[PDB]
Write a protein that binds this ligand. Structure first.
Ligand SMILES: Nc1ncnc2c1ncn2[C@@H]1O[C@H](COP(=O)(O)OP(=O)(O)O)[C@@H](O)[C@H]1O
Ligand code: BEF
Ligand SMILES: [Cl-]
Ligand SMILES: [Cl-]
Ligand SMILES: [Cl-]
Ligand SMILES: [Cl-]
Ligand SMILES: [Cl-]
Ligand SMILES: [Mg+2]
Length: 703
């Protein structure tokens, strides 16, 4: 219908065709620079491929013009169809969606929020005029829960699709299904660091449009030898650039909040020393991480300070960021990128069902994306703080997908809320193994989160609101029925983080002496509760909690994580009308209530002692032979125990163990422990004798 040549004549017009206003002089200066971008040379090739194909794979270099120009090309092409629909472009980070939408609003000569806008979690900067909306992929996924056919959008552009986050992979699977349902919906998948053929084959052998060329080069520099202290090498590199290199701002990639703020303190102190001793320029230092407020995140676009004198050494800006700034951003003024090659990446412990963060080496794709923050408006340089051979042989090509590094049972419940019926045949790009998916569906059905037809129950919908492994969420939801919901709230939070115990090899006797203060002989779960209670009591006394945790050989990081999780879980209970209850401590049933309440989440992790004096236990699930882990505080374990973690070393253990009574299993999980259909064996015979001894006693007193 409309060619690239026809659209360019409308772009050259004195009048804005979207608003009716006169085009500003800033618009024409930007348009002049935009047409020199590498993607503009293949605009008609894009439009021809967009007309004749439903799904398109787009590859071009960092800064070539993918995120800014391609949605504007679609916008000029899509308007005469009069659909009243929107164009969606998903960014990985909130700061990318806000920054790009402001830039494209300037490029279209419109006001941000009116014709170009953004939509993030707590801010919908859109209106009825909005035709192009940049957003996070999590925001589009939240919209798909209420609108499964994506009815507000005519084109959905999945940007930075190489990242393979949980939201990106799920969006790609939903949009692949929707493309067979909705032929009036276009899909564009783009990145600079993409496995193009893998993405093409996944999207029904979609065509590839590859744009070559760069606006400006990025020179890559490697170190001649490996260096362990990457923070020290990062700070040294930043100061060496400020002392010797010409004008240009620095972007430094670090891994977390505490590491960044400490490095920002160290860089500023050394800069203050270089100023008074060497006539160096001023350098402003900006931190950037996800927990920063957005107005303080936006400060990274501020101009570098002026030099101290005419002809003096240049003033400079140093941004110290996580991988929140790894992709999409155009920070004008940046010339230098420092890449230590590390990031906090999510791992999943399958034995504890705990997601946590681990400082890990980055992928080759991530290193190319970090370098691509330079070379956008001027030439750039990237200092990789690792050898060239380490780049070529030690870094993986792409980071492993998040769905294979996450709690799959949490993912299944979210997919049910998104309307996925068949989980076994849900076509993800890199699906989990069918045994792993069937294991998650089996556990969720036994936990009554999915019914026997696979459909979501009200308990499973409520459990999915909690940022927890679903067995922990079921235990928390069920805890008012055991009159100990305040203590289960604490235990659930502690079980959602890694273990708090710190036992260094040179001070293991002192660590055991501190642990014995919290030891409860009837359960490791109560020992965990005592340690958190002592942590909160010392915090209420105004004590240095980093010092307190160090002197008590506890992890301040995991304890403060659990305390922060406990506040989040307490809001969700109060929101959904779930009472916060405690039994008085001197009540005779105080501890038995908490040990009973554990079985509402963990009735499938139960072991029975084999003989009268044996140390060997047999698990209810899969009949494994185990010992009680020697780190337990349970000095005399009962015949029946509940456990948190299966441990496979040179011996097989169950860790985090609490004494239970076997009649509690029949009371709390009677469907799972239905003896009329239970698996035959020594475990069933023992539970049969327990049920018979209950029946013998109730028939006696009734007579
Ligand atoms: N905020 C901005 N300020 C100045 N120039 C910008 C800005 N955003 C984008 N540009 C220019 O437009 C180019 C293309 O940016 P963008 O479309 O985001 O690229 P891509 O997504 O392909 O990496 C940049 O390399 C730069 O030259
Ligand atoms: F590929 Be670009 F840097 F978003
Ligand atoms: Cl974000
Ligand atoms: Cl968001
Ligand atoms: Cl001074
Ligand atoms: Cl972050
Ligand atoms: Cl009950
Ligand atoms: Mg982009």
């Amino acid at each position: 219908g409309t060619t690239a040549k026809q659209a360019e004549a409308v772009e050259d017009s004195d009048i804005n065709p979207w608003t009716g206003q006169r085009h500003s002089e800033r618009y024409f200066k930007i348009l002049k620079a935009r047409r020199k971008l590498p993607v503009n040379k293949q605009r008609q090739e894009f439009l021809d491929l967009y007309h004749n194909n439903q799904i398109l794979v787009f590859v071009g270099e960092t800064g070539s013009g993918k995120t800014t120009q391609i949605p504007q090309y679609v916008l000029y092409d899509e308007l005469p169809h009069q659909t009243g629909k929107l164009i969606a472009c998903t960014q990985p980070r909130r700061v990318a969606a806000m920054s790009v939408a402001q830039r494209v609003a300037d490029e279209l000569d419109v006001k941000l929020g009116e014709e170009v806008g953004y939509s993030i979690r707590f801010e919908n900067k859109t209106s009825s005029k909005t035709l192009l909306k940049y957003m996070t992929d999590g925001q589009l996924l939240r919209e798909a829960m209420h609108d499964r056919d994506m009815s507000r959008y005519s084109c959905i552009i999945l940007d930075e699709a190489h990242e393979r986050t949980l939201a990106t992979d799920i969006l790609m699977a939903l949009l692949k299904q929707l493309s067979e349902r909705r032929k009036d919906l276009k899909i564009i998948v783009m990145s600079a660091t993409l496995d193009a053929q893998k993405f093409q084959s996944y999207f029904f052998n979609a065509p590839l449009l590859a744009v070559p060329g760069r606006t400006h080069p990025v020179e890559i520099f490697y170190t001649p030898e490996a260096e362990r202290d990457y923070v020290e090498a990062a700070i040294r590199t930043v100061l060496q650039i400020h002392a010797c290199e010409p004008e240009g701002d620095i972007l430094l990639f670090l891994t977390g909040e505490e590491e960044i703020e400490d490095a920002c303190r160290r860089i500023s102190l050394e800069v203050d020393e270089m100023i008074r001793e060497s006539d160096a320029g001023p350098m402003s230092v900006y931190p950037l991480y996800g927990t920063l407020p957005p107005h303080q995140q936006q400060r990274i676009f501020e101009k570098a300070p002026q030099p101290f004198r005419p002809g003096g050494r240049p003033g400079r800006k140093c941004i110290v960021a996580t991988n929140i700034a790894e992709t999409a951003l155009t920070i004008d003024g940046i010339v230098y990128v420092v890449d230590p090659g590390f990031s906090k990446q999510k791992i999943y412990n399958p034995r504890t069902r705990v997601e946590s963060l681990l400082v890990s080496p980055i992928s080759k794709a991530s290193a190319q994306q970090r370098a691509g923050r330079a070379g956008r408006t001027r030439p750039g340089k990237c200092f990789r703080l690792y050898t060239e051979e380490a780049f070529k042989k030690e870094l993986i090509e792409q980071t492993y997908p998040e769905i294979l590094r996450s709690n799959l049972s949490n993912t299944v419940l979210e997919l049910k809320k998104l309307g996925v019926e068949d989980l076994v045949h849900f076509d993800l790009m890199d699906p989990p193994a069918p045994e792993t998916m069937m294991r998650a569906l089996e556990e969720l059905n036994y936990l009554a989160c999915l019914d026997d037809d696979g459909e979501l129950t009200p308990l499973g919908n409520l459990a999915s609101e909690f940022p927890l492994d679903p067995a922990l969420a079921v235990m928390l939801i069920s805890s008012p029925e055991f009159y100990c919901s305040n203590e289960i709230l604490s235990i659930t939070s502690l079980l959602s983080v890694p273990q708090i115990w710190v036992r260094p090899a040179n001070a293991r006797k002192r660590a055991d002496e501190m642990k014995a203060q919290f030891a409860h002989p009837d359960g490791d779960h109560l020992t965990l509760l005592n340690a958190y209670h002592a942590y909160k009591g010392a915090e209420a006394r105004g004590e240095d909690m980093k010092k307190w945790c160090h002197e008590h050989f506890l992890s301040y990081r995991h304890l403060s994580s659990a305390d922060n999780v406990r506040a989040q879980l307490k809001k969700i209970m109060e929101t959904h009308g779930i009472e916060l209850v405690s039994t008085p401590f001197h009540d005779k049933n105080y501890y038995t209530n908490i040990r009973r309440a554990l079985l509402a989440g963990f009735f499938m992790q139960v072991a029975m002692r084999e003989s009268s004096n044996s140390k060997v236990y047999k698990t209810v699930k899969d009949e494994q032979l185990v010992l009680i882990h020697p780190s337990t505080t349970v000095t005399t374990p009962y015949e029946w125990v509940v456990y948190n973690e299966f441990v496979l070393t040179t011996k097989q253990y169950v860790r985090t163990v609490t004494n239970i009574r076997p009649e509690w299993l029949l009371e709390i999980a009677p469907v799972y422990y239905d003896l009329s259909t239970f698996q035959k064996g020594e475990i069933k015979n023992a539970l049969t004798r327990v049920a018979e001894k209950i029946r013998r006693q109730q028939a006696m007193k009734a007579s």
